[PDB]
């Protein structure tokens with residue numbers, strides 16, 4: 412049989428909860444915001460490890476997938492960049508002269524985006540109505556980009572997030588949310604059996620970031636199909652208005668119900 | 670106070686001991702052996718996480734630090750590439766027409782180097798005398814490159830490794846071993862206190878690789894100064910013949926004693 416590895420860490424010498432994504436983005440920006448400077452490390456709750464280059468968070472508009480390019484060029488009115496990261500999307504809108512605000516729960520991400528020139532509210536999405544300063548919003552356009560629909564989480568979390576966005580939305584507001592329409596890879600079969608034992612929806616993973624001795628919170632993450640997204644929206648304040656594909660990716664337009 | 674994060678994994682859904690480095694190198698080679706394809710993730714025994722791009726293991730000679738370039742161009746006779754990885758150094762020697770053998774304990778690394786065209790013995794360094802096939806060696810030149818001296822480990826491990834290399838060495842053989850002469854960064858103070866409590870030498874870390882659900886063995890790793898290396902060699906079959914610096918890096922030439 413296969414031998415489990417056993418965890419790192421001991422009392423006084425172990426990873427601590429904090430803001431590893433902010434640290435990665437800060438290191439990336441400090442080197443010029445290009446590739447081969449800093450790396451995001453994601454750990455799943457079974458310990459599955461995968462990394463990627465953090466330069467993606469600083470990529471200019473011409474390098475974005477078409478679904479993100481479409482969303483940014485259509486943005487109008489008061490824009491909220493939901494989960495802005497290093498601000499690549501909202502920064503493009505600010506350069507174009509629009510009224511843009513980012514929101515992100517990572518203090519370090521917020522600091523990086525602000526340094527690049529984007530106003531950022533530090534808040535969890537579900538804290539938006541409580542944290543939004545008077546005079547900001549209501550918003551005409553919400554950006555949920557960078558597999559943004561995957562950040563919606565489980566149906567319960569998605570409904571609370573969408574409810575929070577509607578609370579700060581202007582009449583007729585839209586969410587421009589992109590996603591991936593891909594089947595679950597076959598090697599995920601064992602992880603999916605674990606999901607079923609725990610009552611968790613098919614296709615979700617529970618993941619966290621790690622960097623140096625810092626660890627982020629567990630959060631739920633998925634690739635949500637356009638049909639899955641339609642089901643999530645039933646009963647919410649939001650109508651699925653259209654779905655636009657670019658190969659594997661899609662851009663969904665959600666409209667606020669009157 | 671700061672809150673410890675708590676480990677990932679549960680019975681039946683947790684990381685397993687295996688060959689994560691081989692998996693990373695295989696993914697890198699399968700994409701063309703360039704950057705932005707696959708990433709090495711290193712975890713220290715306190716849980717400290719750092720990643721880097723695995724493309725470095727496929728870099729051509731013109732991209733190597735000068736200390737590695739010097740070593741490879743001086744290699745003569747029967748060469749052993751000690752800890753060959755994806756084989757970048759031995760491959761250059763094989764292309765130049767030399768008799769070269771790699772040795773690596775990662776089966777996947779060995780497979781990658783072999784596919785690129787380098788003969789590789791799968792063995793731990795300390796297993797070289799037992800595993801070396803008759804007719805291979807004795808070796809005139811040993812390459813210990815890519816902060817190779819850092820792989821020597823603690824003094825006890827270093828002495829056993831050097832003893833194993835001498836066992837398969839030709840008369841007058843040399844080890845060409847590179848290293849880093851840098852002070853310990855100040856943020857390592859807490860980790861160094863942990864070393865002292867455990868009787869472990871100043872400047873060492875205990876680290877392992879992680880990739881997907883695989884975890885490598887714990888191994889000891891250090892940046893060994895030229896003076897540290899001289900102390901390690903006292904009593905061994907090896908004399909420190911010369912030290913050549915290129916900025917922060919050095920190339921040490923060790924000569925087999927008669």
Ligand SMILES: Nc1ncnc2c1ncn2[C@@H]1O[C@H](CSCC[C@H](N)C(=O)O)[C@@H](O)[C@H]1O
Nearest residue numbers: 494495496515516517520534535536556557
């Ligand atoms: N529940 C939540 N509330 C607020 N921010 C969140 C969040 N979940 C994730 N985030 C933030 O959303 C970002 C996701 S990374 C994507 C960033 C950006 N949309 C881009 O495409 O470049 C991270 O910066 C993370 O801190």
Ligand SMILES: Nc1ncnc2c1ncn2[C@@H]1O[C@H](CSCC[C@H](N)C(=O)O)[C@@H](O)[C@H]1O
Nearest residue numbers: 752753754773774775778792793794814815
């Ligand atoms: N004790 C040991 N015995 C055999 N191989 C070892 C070893 N410790 C580390 N290695 C191998 O040595 C390699 C270190 S990475 C460096 C590879 C190569 N020298 C280069 O510079 O590109 C890894 O492939 C690892 O599997």
